[PDB]
Amino acid sequence: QDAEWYWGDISREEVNEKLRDTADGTFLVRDASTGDYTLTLRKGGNNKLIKIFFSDPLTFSSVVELINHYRNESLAQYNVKLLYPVSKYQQDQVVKEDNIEAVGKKLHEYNTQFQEKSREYDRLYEEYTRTSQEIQMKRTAIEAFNETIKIFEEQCQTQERYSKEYIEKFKREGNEKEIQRIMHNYDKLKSRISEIIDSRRRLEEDLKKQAAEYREIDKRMNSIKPDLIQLRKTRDQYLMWLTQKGVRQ
Amino acid sequence: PPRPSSGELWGIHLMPPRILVECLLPNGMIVTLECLREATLITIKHELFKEARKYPLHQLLQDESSYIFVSVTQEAEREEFFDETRRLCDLRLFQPFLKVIEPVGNREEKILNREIGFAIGMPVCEFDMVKDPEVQDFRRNILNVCKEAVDLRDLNSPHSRAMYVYPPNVESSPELPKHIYNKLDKGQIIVVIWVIVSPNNDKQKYTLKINHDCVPEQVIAEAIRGKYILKVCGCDEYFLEKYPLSQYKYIRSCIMLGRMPNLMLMAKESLYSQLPMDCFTMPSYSRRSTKSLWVINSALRIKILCATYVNVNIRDIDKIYVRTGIYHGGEPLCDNVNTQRVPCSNPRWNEWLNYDIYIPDLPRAARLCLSICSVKGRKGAKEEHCPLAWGNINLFDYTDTLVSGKMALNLWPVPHGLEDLLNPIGVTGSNPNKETPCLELEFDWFSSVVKFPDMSVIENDKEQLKAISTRDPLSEITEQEKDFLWSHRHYCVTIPEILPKLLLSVKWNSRDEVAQMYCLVKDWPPIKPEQAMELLDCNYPDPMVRGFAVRCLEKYLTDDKLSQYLIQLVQVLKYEQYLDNLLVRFLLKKALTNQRIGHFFFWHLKSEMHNKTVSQRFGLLLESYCRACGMYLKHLNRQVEAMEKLINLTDILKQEKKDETQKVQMKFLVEQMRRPDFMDALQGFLSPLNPAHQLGNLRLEECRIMSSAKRPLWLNWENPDIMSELLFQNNEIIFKNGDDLRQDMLTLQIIRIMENIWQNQGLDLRMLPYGCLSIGDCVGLIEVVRNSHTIMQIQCFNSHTLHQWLKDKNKGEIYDAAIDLFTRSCAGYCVATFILGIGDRHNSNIMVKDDGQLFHIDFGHFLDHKKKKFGYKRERVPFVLTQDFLIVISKGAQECTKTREFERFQEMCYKAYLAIRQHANLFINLFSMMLGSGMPELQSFDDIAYIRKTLALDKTEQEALEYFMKQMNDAHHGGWT
Numbered sequence A: 001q002d003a004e005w006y007w008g009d010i011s012r013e014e015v016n017e018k019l020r021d022t023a024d025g026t027f028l029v030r031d032a033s034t035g036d037y038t039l040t041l042r043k044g045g046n047n048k049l050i051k052i053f054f055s056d057p058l059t060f061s062s063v064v065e066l067i068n069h070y071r072n073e074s075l076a077q078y079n080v081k082l083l084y085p086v087s088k089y090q091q092d093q094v095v096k097e098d099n100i101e102a103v104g105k106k107l108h109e110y111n112t113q114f115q116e117k118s119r120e121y122d123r124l125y126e127e128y129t130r131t132s133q134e135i136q137m138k139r140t141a142i143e144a145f146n147e148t149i150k151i152f153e154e155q156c157q158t159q160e161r162y163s164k165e166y167i168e169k170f171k172r173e174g175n176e177k178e179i180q181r182i183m184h185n186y187d188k189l190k191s192r193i194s195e196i197i198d199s200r201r202r203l204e205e206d207l208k209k210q211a212a213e214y215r216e217i218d219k220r221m222n223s224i225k226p227d228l229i230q231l232r233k234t235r236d237q238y239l240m241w242l243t244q245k246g247v248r249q
Numbered sequence B: 001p002p003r004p005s006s007g008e009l010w011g012i013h014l015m016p017p018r019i020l021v022e023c024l025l026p027n028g029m030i031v032t033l034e035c036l037r038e039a040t041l042i043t044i045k046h047e048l049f050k051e052a053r054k055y056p057l058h059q060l061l062q063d064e065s066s067y068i069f070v071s072v073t074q075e076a077e078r079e080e081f082f083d084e085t086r087r088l089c090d091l092r093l094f095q096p097f098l099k100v101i102e103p104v105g106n107r108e109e110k111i112l113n114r115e116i117g118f119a120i121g122m123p124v125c126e127f128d129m130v131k132d133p134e135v136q137d138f139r140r141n142i143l144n145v146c147k148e149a150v151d152l153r154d155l156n157s158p159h160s161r162a163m164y165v166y167p168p169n170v171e172s173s174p175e176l177p178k179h180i181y182n183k184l185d186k187g188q189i190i191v192v193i194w195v196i197v198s199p200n201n202d203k204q205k206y207t208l209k210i211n212h213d214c215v216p217e218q219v220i221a222e223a224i225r226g227k228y229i230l231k232v233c234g235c236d237e238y239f240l241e242k243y244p245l246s247q248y249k250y251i252r253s254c255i256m257l258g259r260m261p262n263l264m265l266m267a268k269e270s271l272y273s274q275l276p277m278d279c280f281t282m283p284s285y286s287r288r289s290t291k292s293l294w295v296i297n298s299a300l301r302i303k304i305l306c307a308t309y310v311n312v313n314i315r316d317i318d319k320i321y322v323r324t325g326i327y328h329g330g331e332p333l334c335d336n337v338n339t340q341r342v343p344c345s346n347p348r349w350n351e352w353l354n355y356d357i358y359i360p361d362l363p364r365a366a367r368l369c370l371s372i373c374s375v376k377g378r379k380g381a382k383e384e385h386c387p388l389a390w391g392n393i394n395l396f397d398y399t400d401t402l403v404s405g406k407m408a409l410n411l412w413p414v415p416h417g418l419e420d421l422l423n424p425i426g427v428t429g430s431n432p433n434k435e436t437p438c439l440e441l442e443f444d445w446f447s448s449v450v451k452f453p454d455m456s457v458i459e460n461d462k463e464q465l466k467a468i469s470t471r472d473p474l475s476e477i478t479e480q481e482k483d484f485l486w487s488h489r490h491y492c493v494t495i496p497e498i499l500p501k502l503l504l505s506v507k508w509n510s511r512d513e514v515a516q517m518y519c520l521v522k523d524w525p526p527i528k529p530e531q532a533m534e535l536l537d538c539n540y541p542d543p544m545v546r547g548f549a550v551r552c553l554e555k556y557l558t559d560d561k562l563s564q565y566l567i568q569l570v571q572v573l574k575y576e577q578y579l580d581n582l583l584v585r586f587l588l589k590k591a592l593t594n595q596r597i598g599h600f601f602f603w604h605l606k607s608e609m610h611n612k613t614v615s616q617r618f619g620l621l622l623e624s625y626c627r628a629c630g631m632y633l634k635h636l637n638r639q640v641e642a643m644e645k646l647i648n649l650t651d652i653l654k655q656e657k658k659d660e661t662q663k664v665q666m667k668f669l670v671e672q673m674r675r676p677d678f679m680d681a682l683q684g685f686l687s688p689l690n691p692a693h694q695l696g697n698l699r700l701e702e703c704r705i706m707s708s709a710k711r712p713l714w715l716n717w718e719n720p721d722i723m724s725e726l727l728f729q730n731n732e733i734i735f736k737n738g739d740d741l742r743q744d745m746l747t748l749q750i751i752r753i754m755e756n757i758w759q760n761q762g763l764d765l766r767m768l769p770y771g772c773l774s775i776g777d778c779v780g781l782i783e784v785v786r787n788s789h790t791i792m793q794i795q796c797f798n799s800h801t802l803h804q805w806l807k808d809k810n811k812g813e814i815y816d817a818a819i820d821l822f823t824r825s826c827a828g829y830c831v832a833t834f835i836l837g838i839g840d841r842h843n844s845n846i847m848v849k850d851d852g853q854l855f856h857i858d859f860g861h862f863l864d865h866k867k868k869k870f871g872y873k874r875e876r877v878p879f880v881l882t883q884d885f886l887i888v889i890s891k892g893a894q895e896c897t898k899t900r901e902f903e904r905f906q907e908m909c910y911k912a913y914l915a916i917r918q919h920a921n922l923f924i925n926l927f928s929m930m931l932g933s934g935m936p937e938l939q940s941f942d943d944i945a946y947i948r949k950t951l952a953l954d955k956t957e958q959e960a961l962e963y964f965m966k967q968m969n970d971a972h973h974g975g976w977t
């Protein structure tokens, strides 16, 4: 019960978080979720589960004998060694208030600060998503501005090709009004293209600014995410200390 | 790209009544023309050429009949408008201009590609631009399924086309539960057959009593006292196949509720001639020295070169690095390998990473999962690692070639709530958005192309084995049990259901063990479809395993259960490594041979086309479906354009008119809905909640804007069916724009599955899983319950107010039926909400019918949503039965917990809770198949562990009943024995 690797009544998911991204040999023993005991050993990126009875007739009198023997001995007899224990007293620190009222008051501080940061992270994620969507909308509209300008430029080419051959016939005819009506329609077409080009230009600047706005929202979320994880785990430690230092059923 | 909004112009949700249009004539001239927003292109082209005579070079212009309009769509497409009967406001123009051109190319092929691209929400021409050889191969190879289905659709007479359009909606088994048979009169049922005579359409009533399992032709024969067909009065449901009458879902439901089954007799030619003839045609794109993997003699190594940029400020983060790992599904094949830590502003590595896995030992489904993480020493000795962007790569391609050479990979944003450093559940491939962090890579070269070996080149006693096969998919399996399953791998054939347990015992990092497991699944006997679905989730990615699971569904999965679990079967499509696989071929085959299946097959895919992670895969699949679905593409486009005008209308209400009163928004609603363009779209189309329901004329007097901030629309339609009075005369649907309805859709699906499990076991616990369908990004429809009211409405402060309200409505001899219905509905929802962890209930969540039937609404949150926000870990009782409900169950008696009625109510809860616990593998598999859908409360298997707690799977069945009994006592403070 006083062993560092024994955690008692803990779920299998709590062991996954504790053995998350650990090296080969990290182990801890817990009460089997039902057997009686189950050893979880990190090896090859997987949290191996090993029942404790543990194979064939029993060769060890106690569980403390089974752990300490195998740490030095290695587990090859069954089929790495138990190199690294997960001490239960390692997290006994960071909960230093040491009395029932100091903890709980500190838990109220941590839980409050956690709800502040949680609402800050949520609203930042809504700006993050809204900016990602509006950036995608502006890129599509720039794609449509590209195709629209191509079409109106094709109208200039088509007008130029068909004209000139007609305007030189109107010059020998002496009809200045027919020349003025062709040039007036060409000025109307070119001015419209200048308006569409300037519209795409302003849309590219709004996208250029909104891309940098997305870039800073992404940095802010990458900075508050680590602080939000540790603040929740600190709150859960002070809460766990409060349940342990309280009446148990 | 997809259209940014549903408005009529870019930046303009709604065109003004008149609008100037720049008309680009084919002579170079440009004519500004004022047009009405609802004017057709025929009218606009005639008005244009009448004005073009007043502009220069008009002698060059030909007849207007020789021209069509072309313009830039909001989807950036250069669309040609061959359908000149379309209104200007329906063209989805990016800007108000039209270019006059002469039609060229294949006209009919361009018209079909336009209609397909409209249903999918994406121009089909963008698939032609894809350079990926796998994408183009999928478009050509999948046409085999399209041809095989259309040939099977007209292999037979119009009856085959009728079985496609109107399939039989029947149960999976002809047998009847003994609590269903006891409602029959000596095994016979009283039904009413109606006939509509030829002149004046006079309806005649024919009550007749026949055997419950009478084939539909037998029913017709009794009515005569013979080639006709039967139809449900009020909807498009037909009794075409020779199933027993009781097996049809409509008749089976009538026997339950004691309602009278009203059918209608019509001639076979009345429906056979009404059916159009679907003709599928081949598209345009269909016409236009290697070493082995086991020969390579080296270990695996991958080189991380550089990353273009990373969005992190150097003030808060110390350094950055690239974390990698080889995965077979969700488990690594070797320990993860990291790169050396580099500064944030300079993300370059040029580092080879050595994985301790021999290359011939790599399995077929091997995948490289990597990410760019940030490390911060920060406080104390421990440091914080946070992922910034992730990416997954299939180490082999669809050709089976091993990856080699340099490779640039654009990474994805980390999903919200995901705190792991890697994301092996995410999709494979590069990010289409090239404005993202790009990671340069390089795989080693073996002087040739490396290919995967061919199938020819690859070669306690009974108990405890049984005990393991009955455990739930997420149960703990020790290494001693893995060595026990692998050593007994040949005896497991007698218990074929243990195959998922055996596959997880295989050392997939061992070429020797995988070679032997392939030969076992080659001759493995079939398993039930409910169990083969597990082999299609993310934990089983092997092609031979997934192929075996698909073959089980091809032979043993009825269309009833296929429609029931279609949501999950669509979700596991994104777990696939490649576009072409047996699963996508099986689903597309069934969707093209059953319009009830293809209807929801279409909408489940269309609803996720906004998601850039699956938009390419779902777009290519929707293309092949719409290419061969026949005349139903016309009906689907009517549903789509109706949903587009609802989206556009609700967008206006919560953006430009958000700061206006209810009366102003209602006046804008009734004025806009009465326009001709709006009336043509939202009248006369099939309901997306149930394609058997025809939505007729809108009843604008009944349409309302609900008082929620999302402004949900309460819409009402007439039933154009000749006999609407026998089913429902009005069809009421709630259109919601703003809230994600995927969790509601899944929960209501689970509720229906739980209710079916109860009915088959003789438990008549009546649930109400109303329709709910997500149609897009936070857009969906919700079925309205006809005569229901929330508990708050009933109260509007005595506890007996609810019981006295049920005394009315059901006054007289129908009182015991209302109390019985209220008790049985409470029992089902008390157990269902406890197992699923639904959000807490209140006077606004709980509704009651005039029937006495109780049910819940707004299943927004499931499982352990509160554990992350509040450290306490408890299994909540969301539906605590107040004294108001207890008085109703006890018929007004005080001391309700000790009455005879409450004790019988407890038996219903215990029977239902244990019944669902016996089918725990089904629900755990259904939740597991959704881990990649992106729903926030279903990201990992730890989120599924909540129903393992509520169902108490790690205990005995007797202990689990004590656990459920204590949970009820803790929430109700006592009274549960």
Ligand SMILES: COc1ncc(-c2ccc3ncnc(-c4cccc(C(=O)N5CCN(C(C)=O)CC5)c4)c3c2)cc1C#N
Pocket: B706, B708, B712, B734, B736, B744, B770, B782, B783, B784, B785, B786, B788, B790, B793, B857, B858, B859, B860
């Ligand atoms: C997840 O989102 C949802 N989930 C389910 C439903 C849903 C489903 C079926 C329903 N079936 C029947 N009624 C409702 C229903 C619910 C609440 C209010 C009303 C209503 O308009 N009232 C106005 C008149 N009045 C007065 C003056 O007292 C009575 C209340 C109707 C239903 C609501 C809706 C949404 C959403 N948004």
